[PDB]
Design a protein around this ligand. Structure first.
Ligand SMILES: *C/C=C(C)/C=C/C=C(C)/C=C/C1=C(C)CCCC1(C)C
Ligand SMILES: *C/C=C(C)/C=C/C=C(C)/C=C/C1=C(C)CCCC1(C)C
Ligand SMILES: *C/C=C(C)/C=C/C=C(C)/C=C/C1=C(C)CCCC1(C)C
Ligand SMILES: CCCCCCCC/C=C\CCCCCCCC(=O)O
Ligand SMILES: CCCCCCCC/C=C\CCCCCCCC(=O)O
Ligand SMILES: CCCCCCCC/C=C\CCCCCCCC(=O)O
Ligand SMILES: CCCCCCCC/C=C\CCCCCCCC(=O)O
Ligand SMILES: CCCCCCCC/C=C\CCCCCCCC(=O)O
Ligand SMILES: CCCCCCCC/C=C\CCCCCCCC(=O)O
Ligand SMILES: CCCCCCCC/C=C\CCCCCCCC(=O)O
Ligand SMILES: CCCCCCCC/C=C\CCCCCCCC(=O)O
Ligand SMILES: CCCCCCCC/C=C\CCCCCCCC(=O)O
Ligand SMILES: CCCCCCCC/C=C\CCCCCCCC(=O)O
Ligand SMILES: CCCCCCCC/C=C\CCCCCCCC(=O)O
Ligand SMILES: CCCCCCCC/C=C\CCCCCCCC(=O)O
Ligand SMILES: CCCCCCCC/C=C\CCCCCCCC(=O)O
Ligand SMILES: CCCCCCCC/C=C\CCCCCCCC(=O)O
Ligand SMILES: CCCCCCCC/C=C\CCCCCCCC(=O)O
Ligand SMILES: CCCCCCCC/C=C\CCCCCCCC(=O)O
Ligand SMILES: CCCCCCCC/C=C\CCCCCCCC(=O)O
Ligand SMILES: CCCCCCCC/C=C\CCCCCCCC(=O)O
Ligand SMILES: CCCCCCCC/C=C\CCCCCCCC(=O)O
Ligand SMILES: CCCCCCCC/C=C\CCCCCCCC(=O)O
Ligand SMILES: CCCCCCCC/C=C\CCCCCCCC(=O)O
Ligand SMILES: CCCCCCCC/C=C\CCCCCCCC(=O)O
Ligand SMILES: CCCCCCCC/C=C\CCCCCCCC(=O)O
Ligand SMILES: CCCCCCCC/C=C\CCCCCCCC(=O)O
Ligand SMILES: CCCCCCCC/C=C\CCCCCCCC(=O)O
Ligand SMILES: CCCCCCCC/C=C\CCCCCCCC(=O)O
Ligand SMILES: CCCCCCCC/C=C\CCCCCCCC(=O)O
Ligand SMILES: CCCCCCCC/C=C\CCCCCCCC(=O)O
Ligand SMILES: [Br-]
Ligand SMILES: [Br-]
Ligand SMILES: [Br-]
Ligand SMILES: [Br-]
Ligand SMILES: [Br-]
Ligand SMILES: [Br-]
Lengths: 219, 219, 219
């Protein structure tokens, strides 16, 4: 059931918050404190999201099905900080950070429209959102990777691992969406919740630990 | 169904036993033989547990629901050896080993009471068990980590990885418990089985391979 | 439902194809192009398989249950290339490649018979197929590992990781089979699909990324 996974989510993120929060405190230097604090805020925003969803908030019947539009509201706050985990580690220039957050915000706003609009109009917005996502796929794979690798020549595998894990994780969201009742409806309203909660935990708690491991490698 | 996962469990642990048992035999030295044998015994105890549960043993109706109390009986034997995987690798002093096994045994006995007592009395014992667990969280994170790192200065990341994977894995057991019919009952009696079988396989077969990889790093 | 997982499979492999195909193009040298192309073909064969299964092809009622015999048809093409990922990396001699592909082909043909024959005759063919699989377990663990380690003395952990991940992944297929309606029928026709789709994705997309990481280590 959706409630069990929303609750699984509530505890997962809150426990991710405590872990990073304890790392934020007793941190070695500024570089380490920032990274631990970025991941602390990400998991706090997510714990907040899951707490509201589990208590029946942020949901409404849209086109005959329960829709947790609150996901867009909070994803709009955590995802720029997830992209900040990458740019902070890469020591990326601000114009490239601007582009990433730019294309990220675009993706969520048009992604939100596809979620609240009926069929077949929703497919247009899905396509537009996927294109904003494919713009992000290019930026991380080419300008971001080339700049981070020149700035860290002995750690080309760290950013290679960062980007690939970021690509696998973020690509499964439009896959879940188009297979859920929003698209082709291959599975129920309960599976959508489960898939999103496992994806969210991995994309924030899981990625959190990866970026810290990535910093250990850089030294 | 619970039966499919109990059977998934039976084969998983038995195959973990063969793998470590074959490693126990044809081992390089004493340090390697011990580690392979520790993990061999852990998986044997677990294969035994799952074999009894699958055949309908160690279960009884407690407060109106099937309860596999046999989990506590066998967890009481495998978990001290899981903690021995850490202390053997860290080359930890005996007083610290005493403390860990001490607090581990406490956690399972009070954890067992919470499992067999009705609501709301069960919540008291859950809280006490969680406190015995939080005592373990401190011991691994602070005295254990500081001693293992001084004894191995070039492998601070090995014990860092050991402890974190040990923390993530062991924390999900009280989460499963409090969400199952024992606590807030967010999910069925079938999901509890599934979650525990995936957790057990990871905490013994999965952790088994991690500790061997941790020894490879130490050389 | 089976349809949701078959569709999950269709997109997973197709996205694995694009990733490796883009790696195949813009590759550093011949050693890198070959590896990226091997994994590109593997995922293409798998995307093809899942596309046919999702559209209702390659299935027929055998002994009173839907049976996707098409799995054997395509597994017969992808698995020799999965074994080629190992031998290409190990720089293995052709007689050992011959033996592996030999025993692999045997396993699938007798494995296919067990799938299409009734009970209890099916158990004989299962046993024969498992023995062809245990012949593969020996070849990878002993002749393959000893040759790859002499040819790469500073990367004994790369092939150690290759083989173990290959063993864990490939062993779960006869476990799924014997627990499914083909054997002891512990779970439904829907769980069999799900388990096979998660196993296939890991054994091709997952293993694909591992073998590339293994090449990075070799340099
Ligand atoms: C913790 C939450 C994260 C990392 C959210 C990720 C969401 C996306 C990458 C957006 C995916 C979508 C498309 C690209 C197509 C339209 C439908 C969406 C919004 C699910
Ligand atoms: C292979 C089995 C393992 C590693 C068992 C782990 C079990 C625990 C860490 C105990 C968890 C519990 C609490 C701390 C609260 C009360 C309920 C328990 C017994 C599930
Ligand atoms: C991508 C597909 C892969 C890697 C297929 C793997 C299949 C096997 C290793 C075969 C397993 C079987 C036995 C050894 C016993 C009989 C039943 C089978 C065919 C499931
Ligand atoms: C939801 C839970 C909210 C997060 C709670 C605490 C974050 C951890 C803060 C730890 C600071 C304590 C001082 C210390 O490190 O000794
Ligand atoms: C039924 C009543 C609901 C239970 C009440 C509170 C849930 C406790 C979880 C709170 C953890 C803090 C995470 C957060 O910051 O949102
Ligand atoms: C229906 C109410 C929806 C609330 C508005 C959601 C904003 C999220 C967004 O930025 O797209
Ligand atoms: C809510 C999430 C916070 C939103 C936006 C933060 C983006 C700021 C990016 C600026 C780069 C950091 C810097 O100035 O050093
Ligand atoms: C939001 C606005 C961002 C505008 C800055 C974009 C600069 C492009 C340079 C680049 O990303 O390579
Ligand atoms: C830097 C980029 C910032 C993001 C800008 C997003 C661009 C928005 C453009 C089109 C979205 C349409 C407006 C959403 C209204 C939908 C109405 C509804 O709720 O159904
Ligand atoms: C700042 C950009 C946010 C634009 C999204 C607004 C659409 C949500 C709504 O319909 O109220
Ligand atoms: C009965 C309904 C049949 C189901 C049809 C499902 C076929 C899948 C079709 C389209 C999948 C969408 C493509 C995945 C999004 C890619 C976006 C990206 O990351 O670039
Ligand atoms: C040292 C860092 C490695 C240790 C632990 C990282 C694992 C984090 C566990 C969350 C996994 C996310 C998921 O798939 O559910
Ligand atoms: C911590 C250092 C280890 C870095 C290696 C990371 C490799 C694992 C990465 C991705 C695999 C996880 C993808 C599967 C997500 C599960 C959620 C879902 O799809 O439902
Ligand atoms: C349940 C299965 C019980 C475990 C069985 C065997 C453990 C492996 C022992 C291998 C020793 C054989 C001698 C050798 O290594 O050549
Ligand atoms: C129905 C009959 C039950 C099937 C009988 C035995 C199961 C075989 C598994 C035995 C593996 C040994 C693992 C162990 O040591 O417990
Ligand atoms: C009811 C019978 C329970 C058997 C006793 C379980 C002992 C496990 C424990 O040490 O807590
Ligand atoms: C059943 C599990 C076995 C129980 C307890 C073993 C604990 C012994 C710890 C002593 C440290 C090892 C040593 O003496 O070198
Ligand atoms: C059981 C009894 C254990 C008693 C020994 C505990 C010594 C405390 C020293 C320490 O763990 O830091
Ligand atoms: C070194 C620590 C060893 C472990 C000691 C555990 C302490 C036991 C204290 C209290 C538990 C209560 C006794 C259990 C009886 C419960 C009765 C029942 O089965 O319902
Ligand atoms: C309808 C019932 C609502 C469900 C309420 C669920 C709220 C979750 C509340 C408490 C979770 C327990 C905290 C997790 C245990 C932490 C123990 C530890 O590792 O330190
Ligand atoms: C070399 C060591 C790494 C290789 C394999 C470790 C993977 C063990 C597979 C068990 C995973 C546990 C699980 O999550 O089900
Ligand atoms: C073998 C060396 C690799 C070491 C890195 C290990 C990182 C992965 C660790 C933990 C992630 C797994 C946690 C999820 C457990 C699944 C069981 C469940 O929660 O139901
Ligand atoms: C199903 C999808 C089929 C696979 C499609 C494309 C593989 C990628 C080929 C990329 C070559 C483009 C040239 C380039 O690298 O710039
Ligand atoms: C209902 C109609 C079915 C949908 C049609 C096509 C599915 C699109 C997926 C095609 C991706 C190419 C992968 C492949 O090579 O097989
Ligand atoms: C019934 C039709 C089966 C088609 C033949 C399958 C061949 C696969 C194999 O090589 O075993
Ligand atoms: C369809 C899968 C292709 C089948 C068989 C390819 C096996 C060829 C093995 C020969 C070794 C490669 C070589 O000649 O260098
Ligand atoms: C198919 C035929 C393969 C015959 C070649 C086998 C040579 C055996 C040598 C070896 O693998 O160690
Ligand atoms: C190099 C090894 C090549 C593989 C050879 C496989 C050996 C085949 C031997 C016996 C399998 C029996 C023939 C299959 C017919 C089954 C009839 C049916 O479809 O039900
Ligand atoms: C009601 C039915 C009871 C279910 C009985 C299940 C017992 C499991 C029995 C046999 C499992 C088969 C052994 C696993 C295959 C090993 C092949 C290999 O990798 O070597
Ligand atoms: C750099 C290479 C490591 C990065 C990513 C590998 C993870 C691949 C994700 C597929 C996991 C397969 C699965 O279990 O579903
Ligand atoms: C990419 C480099 C990392 C290498 C370490 C790999 C360790 C993980 C390996 C195996 C664990 C996955 C096994 C579980 C398969 C899930 C599918 C299923 O059983 O249903
Ligand atoms: Br969020
Ligand atoms: Br560097
Ligand atoms: Br156990
Ligand atoms: Br060291
Ligand atoms: Br295939
Ligand atoms: Br080497």
């Amino acid at each position: 059931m959706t409630q069990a996974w929303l609750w699984i989510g509530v505890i997962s993120m809150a426990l991710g918050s405590v872990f990073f929060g304890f790392g934020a405190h007793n941190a070695k230097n500024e570089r380490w404190q920032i990274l631990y604090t970025l991941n602390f805020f990400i998991c706090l925003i997510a714990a907040g999201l899951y707490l509201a969803m589990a208590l029946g908030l942020g949901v409404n019947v849209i086109n005959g099905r329960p829709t947790y539009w609150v996901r867009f509201v909070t994803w709009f706050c955590s995802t720029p900080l997830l992209l900040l985990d990458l740019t902070f580690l890469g020591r990326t220039s601000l114009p490239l950070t601007g582009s990433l957050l730019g294309a990220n915000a675009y993706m969520l706003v048009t992604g939100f429209v596809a979620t609240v609009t009926p069929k077949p109009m929703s497919y247009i917005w899905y396509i537009v959102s996927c294109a904003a996502y494919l713009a992000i796929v290019y930026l991380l794979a080419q300008p971001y990777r080339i700049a981070a690798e020149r700035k860290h020549p002995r750690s080309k595998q760290a950013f290679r691992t960062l980007v690939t894990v970021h690509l696998v994780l973020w690509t499964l969201y439009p896959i879940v969406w188009i297979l859920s009742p929003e698209g082709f409806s291959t599975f129920t309203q309960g599976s959508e919740t489960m898939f999103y909660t496992l994806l969210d935990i991995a994309s924030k708690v899981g990625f959190g630990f990866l970026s810290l491991n990535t910093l250990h490698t850089l030294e």
